[PDB]
Every structure is written in C-alpha cells, then in structure tokens.
Write a protein that binds this ligand. Structure first.
Ligand code: ZN
Length: 46
C-alpha cells in the first residue's frame, strides 16, 4: 500500500487489525486502512 505500518507492508496500519479480510467481505486480505474490517472498529489497539 501507500501507507503501511511499522511492521512494513506485511500487515496493515491498524494495530488491532491483522490484515486478513476486508470491511467489504469480498477479498482475502489487505495491507492498508482502506481494507481494514476492524479499522478503528472498537478494537483499534490491543
Ligand atoms: Zn487491516
């Protein structure tokens, strides 16, 4: 992606999210906050 996380583009920016799935539910995984199905979704940082 354009804006990843400290863990590189191996996972997505959101710490509470892992990178697999989508808020959409139409893909397998993502690497940015654009696909985070948990994007600041209550469990934003655990
Ligand atoms: Zn994510």
């Amino acid at each position: 992606g354009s804006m990843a996380a400290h863990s590189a583009d191996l996972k997505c920016p959101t710490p509470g999210c892992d990178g697999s799935g989508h808020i959409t539910g139409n893909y397998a995984s993502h690497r940015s906050l654009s696909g985070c199905p948990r994007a600041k979704k209550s469990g934003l940082r655990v």
